[PDB]
């Protein structure tokens, strides 16, 4: 289980849907994937050695996205999906572009980051709402079996990942825009000295700083929430979710900057 609040018992079962296991893909930073822009600095037409929170090159990404329809498997709310946060993670996220009456809509998995997922501790949550990325850090009463929905196409169940009837205490609450038309989003989430840090990019590969947040407590787990939808499958539209993650660590990279300050290449 993620939290411990019994939000519902509707359509829960124990089926091992991952008969083929967690899907994997290989980290390759040679085109600037996994890198981020350094503070407020600009470098031009040059190569820098820099030490930062980066992926290991030639490590695996894991796809932790989980599309459901009606039933939720209890096995989705355990290891290997519930994952140790350590120093941090890098995410490569497919923007699942759907259509209704030729209008475009953007969906992708919510991620939660925390320690015990109980309302006496802060949980960070990052959730898309069709071009608005809502980010919060609050004492959420997380469910046992949290999940989200396709607000665009609809779902066979209502949304529930927390159960707070009155607004919980929050250290942070902001919205950030993202371009609904791009195919990928990239994120770094990491912690140093009890402060959480977030970088993203919705265009290109090198990420840029969103925010930082003092927690005063070590984060220790993260989890990518299942998404339930009447769309997003081979019998209806051949679309897919993907939410690739890999661990960060303190590493030295060569970074190459072009003559307009974009990071074009890197070496581990
Ligand atoms: C912070 O997070 C914690 C969890 O970590 C929350 O604690 C839980 O709070 C709920 C709500 O108060 C407790 O709910 C339990 O409900 C049982 C009945 O549930 C059914 O019926 C009710 C209507 O009566 C429906 O609302 C519900 O949806 C279900 O259909 C009760 O039986 C439970 O009673 C317990 O105590 C009696 C003795 O007094 C025993 O006989 C019972 O067997 C049982 O042990 C209870 O009322 C839930 O139990 C709480 N869990 C824990 C671990 O404490 C906090 O509420 C939350 N804080 C804030 C501010 O939101
Ligand atoms: C994490 C994972 O494994 N995710 C897959 C999902 C689950 O394994 C399954 O949900 C588990 O179920 C449990 C735990 O009991 O199966 C999906 O594929 C289904 C067939 O496997 C799909 O075709 C559905 O077929 C139906 O016969 C039915 O109900 O399963 C009718 C329903 O309308 C239709 N869904 C639609 C229209 O999207 C799906 O989607 O649900 C593809 C997802 O990638
Ligand atoms: C950040 O972005 C989110 C997502 O867009 C904003 O949340 C949404 O805010 C609106 C306005 O408060 C909510 O609409 C209201 O909902 C109630 C309940 O259904 C209804 O009675 C009102 O008439 C009105 O429609 C909306 O529900 C809410 N959530 C979602 C998923 O859209 C949020 O306001 C933005 N700002 C901040 C600082 O978070
Ligand atoms: C979790 O909460 C659900 C309700 O959302 C509980 O299910 C009810 O259990 C009582 C036990 O007396 C039954 O009379 C009801 O018919 C059940 N359903 C509903 C809709 O209330 C469930 O027992 C709780 N606990 C667990 C471990 O699932
Ligand atoms: C960017 O740096 C490169 C590499 O130093 C520069 O390329 C050289 O440019 C000179 C002419 O100024 C040529 O004679 C060399 O043959 C080039 N070397 C290579 C490896 O291509 C480039 O001029 C710089 N551009 C800017 C705008 O700073
Ligand atoms: C939002 O994302 C789309 C897709 O990446 C961007 O569209 C591209 O824009 C450039 C010019 O800036 C064109 O050369 C490409 O041909 C466009 N691609 C497609 C598929 O249309 C769009 O510019 C982005 N807009 C913002 C405001 O970020
Ligand atoms: C969804 O919410 C509506 C309105 O509260 C309720 O009538 C319905 O039973 C709920 N369905 C599920 C599966 O939670
Ligand atoms: C999904 O793709 C397969 C392979 O091309 C095809 O057989 C199937 O009919 C497609 N279904 C839809 C809804 O596009």
UniProtKB/Swiss-Prot annotation:
Positions annotated as glycosylated: 6, 16, 45, 101, 119, 158, 175, 179, 238
Function, in words: Attaches the virion to the cell membrane by interacting with host receptor, initiating the infection.
Native source organism of the sequence: Human coronavirus HKU1 (isolate N1)
Protein name in the entry: Spike protein S1
Disulfide bonds: 7-143, 138-170, 150-229
Portion held of the full protein: 14 to 281 of 1356
Domain annotation BetaCoV S1-NTD: ranges: 1-268
